[PDB]
Amino acid sequence: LLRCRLPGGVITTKQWQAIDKFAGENTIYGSIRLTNRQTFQFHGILPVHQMLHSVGLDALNDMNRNVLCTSNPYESQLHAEAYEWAKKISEHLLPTYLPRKFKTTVVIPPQNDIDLHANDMNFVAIAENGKLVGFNLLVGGGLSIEHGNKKTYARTASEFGYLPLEHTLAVAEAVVTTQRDWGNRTDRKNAKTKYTLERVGVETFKAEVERRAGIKFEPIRPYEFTGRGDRIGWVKGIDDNWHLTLFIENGRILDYPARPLKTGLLEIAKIHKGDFRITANQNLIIAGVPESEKAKIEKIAKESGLMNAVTPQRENSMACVSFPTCPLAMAEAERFLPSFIDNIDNLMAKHGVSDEHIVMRVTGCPNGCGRAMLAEVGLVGKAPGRYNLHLGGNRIGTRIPRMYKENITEPEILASLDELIGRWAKEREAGEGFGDFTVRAGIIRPVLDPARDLWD
Numbered sequence: 001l002l003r004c005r006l007p008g009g010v011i012t013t014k015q016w017q018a019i020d021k022f023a024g025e026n027t028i029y030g031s032i033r034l035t036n037r038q039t040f041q042f043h044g045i046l047p048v049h050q051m052l053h054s055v056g057l058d059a060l061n062d063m064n065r066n067v068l069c070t071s072n073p074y075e076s077q078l079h080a081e082a083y084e085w086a087k088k089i090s091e092h093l094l095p096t097y098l099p100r101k102f103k104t105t106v107v108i109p110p111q112n113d114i115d116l117h118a119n120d121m122n123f124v125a126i127a128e129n130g131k132l133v134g135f136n137l138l139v140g141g142g143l144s145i146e147h148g149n150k151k152t153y154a155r156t157a158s159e160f161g162y163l164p165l166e167h168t169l170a171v172a173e174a175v176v177t178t179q180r181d182w183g184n185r186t187d188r189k190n191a192k193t194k195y196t197l198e199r200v201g202v203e204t205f206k207a208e209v210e211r212r213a214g215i216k217f218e219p220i221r222p223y224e225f226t227g228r229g230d231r232i233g234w235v236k237g238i239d240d241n242w243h244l245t246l247f248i249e250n251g252r253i254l255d256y257p258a259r260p261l262k263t264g265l266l267e268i269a270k271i272h273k274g275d276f277r278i279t280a281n282q283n284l285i286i287a288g289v290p291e292s293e294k295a296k297i298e299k300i301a302k303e304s305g306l307m308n309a310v311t312p313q314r315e316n317s318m319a320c321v322s323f324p325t326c327p328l329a330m331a332e333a334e335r336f337l338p339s340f341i342d343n344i345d346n347l348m349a350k351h352g353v354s355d356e357h358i359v360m361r362v363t364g365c366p367n368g369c370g371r372a373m374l375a376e377v378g379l380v381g382k383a384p385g386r387y388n389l390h391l392g393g394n395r396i397g398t399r400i401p402r403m404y405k406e407n408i409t410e411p412e413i414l415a416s417l418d419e420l421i422g423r424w425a426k427e428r429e430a431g432e433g434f435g436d437f438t439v440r441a442g443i444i445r446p447v448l449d450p451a452r453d454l455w456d
């Protein structure tokens, strides 16, 4: 288990060739596993640092995780600056010993693909005239819980306010240090920013950030999100450039019989002009393809099975690694997802909603790596073949799903979803999401204040 520091998930093709080689000749699984934090992982490393170092990559005492950045903004020009800022916060936060690991993102509305509410510190980009002018700071998200422990909880991030671009690093540092100092010194399970905020108060925390940063936040500038999914397929970028996002189930890059995904990405990397972007959804964007290069790239991706069409449901589903490599796994996630969505696809078709989607996620244990706690339908592993079923989140990821059923099996999960989806298909309003609907229809009470009403 080695993991690289790759802000915004942008990786060059040169770097891609060096990791593809290593993955194949020096690991048990021979795979490249894209993670939901925009970086990659090798599994079963049988040196790695000199390999990383040689292509300019570095492997992260440091309580800092990979800083995310919206990978494919609708206003393509905004990416360059937002990415430059992600990269700067990354290097800036690089060595203080934090009580718990600190997660940070730079978001570009209206896309919340980086799933901000799962993170400690978030900078929501505010642009004017195609230029970033500042950020809206949201602080305090975290998804990890412990089964049966009502003192733990998933929490969404809180809005602190707006800050001009210039005050970015000072604020970033102030948040880190204030969590570092105020973080719970007695228990590690209460040491996350989300716990500290609830202990001292958002306002008490905010006032301190201001004092330390040397500024005063301005009121939050309007922003809204419309989704969290990737833009699978070709999208027009700036100039004559195009972006091809490839759907990769579980982000597992390996050559399968008749679907050489791994060789396919290597072939593309060899003729690709720009670079690649690893998404927060475990997919890969072949970025900056000249219009003239579209057919060449598409030809390879197509041959390799990288462009095999899947349903919208599949494209919007996610699972953590879990078995066989995770030591904390309670139930299958990655290896369970595919056949599981095979089942969901059938139920979707049975209900005439095959063109629809439900943000469906499966996490192998309460730690929550699969981000099931921000899904419309989340599966939290409890034991082999068993999961806690949570319902009631939303498409954009701003609501925590309450536990609906506990410790049940797939046949039981499927039987419950069969009935709920059927109701949704027939009783929903125009454009109404499944999560919102379960809450509107009274199928599940909403979680309005995580720290106080997440547990029944």
Ligand code: SRM
Pocket (backbone or CB within 6 Å): 001, 003, 034, 035, 036, 037, 038, 039, 040, 041, 065, 066, 100, 101, 103, 115, 118, 141, 142, 143, 144, 145, 192, 282, 319, 320, 321, 322, 325, 326, 327, 328, 367, 368, 369, 370, 371
């Ligand atoms: C690879 C990935 C899930 C995936 O399939 O993509 C993952 C994989 C692993 N996670 Fe994670 N988590 C991943 C994103 C996160 C997420 C979601 C996110 O960050 O977007 C969270 C939930 C949000 C949160 O932090 O609250 C998450 C919360 C945890 C926790 C709980 C931490 C806590 O505060 O309690 C742990 C366990 C721990 O460290 O105590 C952890 C533990 C672990 C490790 C590294 C297991 C371990 O501690 O030894 C899991 C490794 C499995 C394996 O064999 O590879 N992981 N994990 C993600 C790696 C991200 C990265 O590149 O750094």
Ligand code: SF4
Pocket (backbone or CB within 6 Å): 320, 321, 322, 323, 326, 327, 328, 329, 330, 333, 363, 364, 365, 366, 367, 368, 369, 370
């Ligand atoms: S959620 Fe649990 S099982 Fe899944 S990858 Fe994270 S630690 Fe392992």
Ligand SMILES: [K+]
Pocket (backbone or CB within 6 Å): 247, 248, 249, 250, 251, 281, 282, 283
């Ligand atoms: K994926």
